[PDB]
Design a protein around this ligand. Structure first.
Ligand SMILES: CC(=O)N[C@@H]1[C@@H](O)[C@H](O)[C@@H](CO)O[C@H]1O
Ligand SMILES: CC(=O)N[C@@H]1[C@@H](O)[C@H](O)[C@@H](CO)O[C@H]1O
Ligand SMILES: *[C@@H]1O[C@H](CO)[C@@H](O)[C@H](O)[C@H]1NC(C)=O
Length: 606
């Protein structure tokens, strides 16, 4: 179809499958294995990208061009690495991936939405769609084309450090919230074949259903450990949302570090090829986790030869190396040259990678759009995050006795009020993990509104607002306060750092609630990624709200505290009485919750 130097794969009017086959038929083994290789930006250079024909780059948590970088700085970084890849013989663009899991959360000034546990509490899949929509725009603001989300783990034990990354312990809720996928990617057309990848174009991103499969079912909630459950229970609890993800055209699937009955996911051919690919008919690309193939062995990295063979034969297509690319490429090349990995396996992997790249429009728009930079932290998106935060809140108590006046909603007009606690004025704590840094961080880490800021923004001008982080009992008694709002809870964490067998919040937390509530009628705002030991907090408090990890828009919290909207959130997880009960789900036998799944009190707007 026309000039003498025509190349079919470069013709945007041709069918994706024809473009994929055309390009594939031209590629050398080095060019094929290059597509299968994803490296960290920290090891990337123009020569490295060109000389090893690299297929993909990522930023891990905290991997940023610099602290405070603008959207434009991100675009220019991404474009520099793209220019190198486009300069190879075949000019195959790279795809850049990142953990944009509650907004474009590594980026300064990005809107930070509630983490998944709170979204589960909203029971609003359209809200979650809109969050996917907004997140795609903020990811494209930075020139990035690929988000490692959604996490569709079904967390069955809250001692897991990733429980906040699960929408719920109930798979039906997780299933409903796969609407994040068409938000991030665009809706699939009416004719669509389940399992095909889809991304609408340059204003959308490729998505990633993760981590396949049973990541939320591990023993004692130990992150990346073994999930012991029969096939029936794997398929009834952990798998279903993957089929909803196929039906919505999820582009990619990331494999879990976890094992299923002692078999590493990253080596599990029956599940990755037999089930995901051959039974679900998945046609996008399967990606490893970060040194996931290394960790097939114990110790990790003790037979990288075997890791490469096991993973690739199992059916993984792209490998998140992410640093030792030369070793990865060399070992895989050697296995193919030795006949240990057939060319049919390499060609399948490359076909899937190229199918996602052509489908999403990456060969037509390999570079960033500078007009999209201004999408970052946009007010419309902050309004959406505020709505989500407010909708996520679960009211657990609202009066000590059944005869007390309901504390919430609080009046905006009062002579003097107290805001107190470690989490009342700490933006980093209210965002939790995967925010700026991998593990999150403390204090004013990005643009947002703390709970204290939000109070000051909500109250009548005649209300005096006093902040004290950890006031003693006498301070409160002597202060002439109408009421207090006290915010306490967990510190930020991510992955194995968040694994916690006691689930008791750090001090001073309880002690400040006790001091404050001892003095004046109090509304306690509990910031956590999960249920935590709550009976002592409840005993002290007039009202108590489970606000989860509500993100940058702290006005969502005060929207409900002051009655602009009613409380509507409901527990998306069981609240336990004691950690000795765990695991405890919601049709066991020892099922004896403090608050059952679905519990939540309501108020009416004032
Ligand atoms: C590994 C882990 O999460 N351990 C926590 C620990 O940090 C804390 O000091 C302890 C108090 O019992 O609660 C548990
Ligand atoms: C007419 C009207 O405003 N009705 C609602 C009522 O349904 C609800 O019981 C009450 C207290 O929950 O809040 C208000
Ligand atoms: C689970 O963690 C335990 C305790 O650290 C360790 O013995 C074991 O290797 C882990 N198992 C798996 C499958 O990761």
């Amino acid at each position: 179809h026309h000039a003498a130097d025509y190349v079919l794969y470069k013709d945007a009017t041709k069918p994706v499958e024809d473009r994929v086959a055309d390009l594939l038929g031209r590629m050398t083994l080095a060019e094929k294995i290059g597509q299968m290789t994803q490296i960290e930006r920290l090891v990337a250079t123009p020569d490295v990208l060109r000389d090893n024909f690299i297929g993909s780059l990522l930023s891990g948590g905290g991997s940023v061009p610099r602290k405070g970088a603008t959207a434009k700085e991100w675009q220019d970084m991404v474009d520099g690495f793209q220019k190198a890849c486009m300069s190879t013989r075949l000019g195959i663009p790279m795809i850049y991936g990142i953990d944009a899991v509650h907004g474009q959360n590594n980026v300064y000034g990005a809107t930070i939405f509630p983490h998944n546990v709170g979204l589960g509490a909203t029971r609003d899949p359209y809200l979650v769609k809109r969050i996917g929509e907004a997140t795609a725009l903020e990811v494209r603001a930075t020139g990035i084309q690929y988000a490692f989300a959604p996490c569709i783990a079904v967390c069955r034990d809250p001692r897991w450090g990733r429980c906040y990354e699960s929408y719920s312990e109930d798979r039906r809720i997780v299933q409903s919230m796969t609407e994040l996928i068409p938000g991030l990617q665009g809706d699939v057309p009416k004719d669509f074949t389940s399992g095909m990848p889809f991304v609408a174009g340059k204003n959308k991103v490729a998505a990633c259903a993760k981590h396949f499969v049973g990541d939320g079912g591990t023993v004692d909630g130990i992150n990346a450990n073994n999930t012991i459950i029969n096939r029936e229970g794997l398929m009834n609890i952990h798998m279903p949302a993957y089929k909803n993800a196929m039906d919505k055209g999820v582009s990619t699937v990331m494999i879990s570090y976890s094992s299923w009955n002692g078999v590493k996911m990253h080596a599990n051919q029956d599940l990755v090829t037999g089930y995901l690919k051959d039974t679900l008919k998945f046609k996008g690309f399967v990606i490893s986790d970060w040194e996931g193939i290394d960790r097939i062995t114990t110790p990790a990295g003790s037979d990288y030869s075997y890791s490469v063979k096991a993973s690739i034969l199992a059916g993984l297509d792209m490998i998140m190396v992410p640093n030792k690319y030369q070793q990865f490429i060399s070992i895989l090349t050697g296995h193919v040259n030795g006949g240990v990995i057939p060319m049919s396996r390499i060609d399948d992997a490359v076909t899937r990678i190229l199918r996602v790249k052509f489908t999403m429009g990456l060969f037509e728009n390999p570079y960033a759009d500078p007009a999209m930079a201004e999408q970052l932290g946009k007010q419309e998106h902050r309004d959406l995050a505020r709505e989500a935060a407010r909708k996520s809140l679960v009211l657990l108590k609202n009066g000590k006795t059944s005869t007390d006046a309901p504390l919430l909603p609080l009046p905006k007009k009062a002579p003097k009020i107290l805001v107190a606690g470690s989490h009342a004025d700490n933006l980093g704590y209210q965002c939790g993990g995967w925010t700026i840094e991998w593990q999150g961080d403390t204090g004013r880490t990005t643009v947002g509104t703390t709970i204290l800021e939000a109070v000051k923004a909500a109250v009548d001008p005649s209300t005096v607002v006093v902040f004290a982080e950890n006031p003693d009992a006498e301070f409160v008694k002597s202060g002439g306060f109408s009421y207090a709002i006290v915010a306490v809870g967990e510190h930020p964490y991510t992955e194995t750092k968040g694994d916690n067998l006691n689930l008791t919040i750090p001090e001073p937390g309880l002690s400040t609630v006790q001091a404050v509530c001892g003095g004046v009628r109090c509304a306690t705002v509990l910031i956590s990624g999960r249920p935590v030991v709550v009976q002592p907090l409840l005993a002290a408090s007039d009202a108590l709200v489970a606000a989860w990890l509500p993100g940058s828009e702290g006005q969502g919290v005060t929207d409900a505290l002051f009655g602009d909207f009613g409380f509507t959130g409901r527990l998306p997880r069981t609240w336990f009485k004691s950690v000795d009960q765990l695991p405890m789900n919601v049709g066991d036998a020892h099922y004896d919750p403090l608050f059952r799944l679905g519990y939540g009190l309501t108020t009416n707007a004032t």
